[PDB]
Paper text:
S. scabies produces a 200-residue, 22-kDa protein that is a single-domain enzyme called Scabin. Scabin has been cloned, expressed, and purified, and shown to harbor dual enzymatic activities (GH and ADP-ribosyltransferase). Scabin targets DNA as a substrate for ADP-ribose modification; it also shows enzyme specificity towards genomic DNA from Solanum tuberosum tubers. Scabin shares nearly 40% sequence identity with the Pierisin family of mARTs.
Scabin has some common catalytic features with other members of the mART toxin family. This includes the key Arg (Arg77), which is important for NAD+ binding to the active site; the Ser-Thr-Thr motif (Ser117-Thr118-Thr119), which comprises the scaffold of the NAD+ binding site; and the hallmark catalytic Gln-X-Glu motif (Gln158-X-Glu160). Other residues that were studied included two NAD+-only interacting residues, such as Ser117 found in the STT(S) NAD+ binding motif and Glu160 in the Q-X-E motif. The S-T-S/T motif is known for its role in binding and positioning the NAD+ substrate in CT-like mART toxins. The rest of the Scabin variants showed either a WT-like crystal structure or similar CD spectra to the WT in solution.
Numbering used by the authors: 36 to 200
Amino acid sequence: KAAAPACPRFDDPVHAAADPRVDVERITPDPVWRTTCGTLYRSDSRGPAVVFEQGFLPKDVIDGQYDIESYVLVNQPSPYVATTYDHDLYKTWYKSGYNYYIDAPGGVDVNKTIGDRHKWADQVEVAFPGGIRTEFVIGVCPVDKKTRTEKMSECVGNPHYEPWH
């Protein structure tokens, strides 16, 4: 066996952003940025033809909700795209057709930023300001809704994924 190396640290905390107009200075409270580089996940009903082409774009980088606690607690258009550390969080998401696999630098670690006592701490979220370019989306597995399992023979890799570590 072999021990794992550390992660490349990018200088720009929103290097991964699909929409660079995001204003890092407006993020509240003070963000604690993720410095690890393991696979993250996103439940999304949008199909891979769209996500692989566009990446994950945020709803509103201009007038969206930049306060993380507010965005977590009350769903409102925001500059953030939510992801999770938890491969299995898709099992709790009703109706979301796909479990996307993400290999992206950075993101705001929600529980490190607003604590792990809030209602949704169990989501172990990483919030990406400005979203996530397609080159950081590994791929996707569709989810069977009846059993809350991945349809592993129907997973698809993103042709635009660019490994970086």
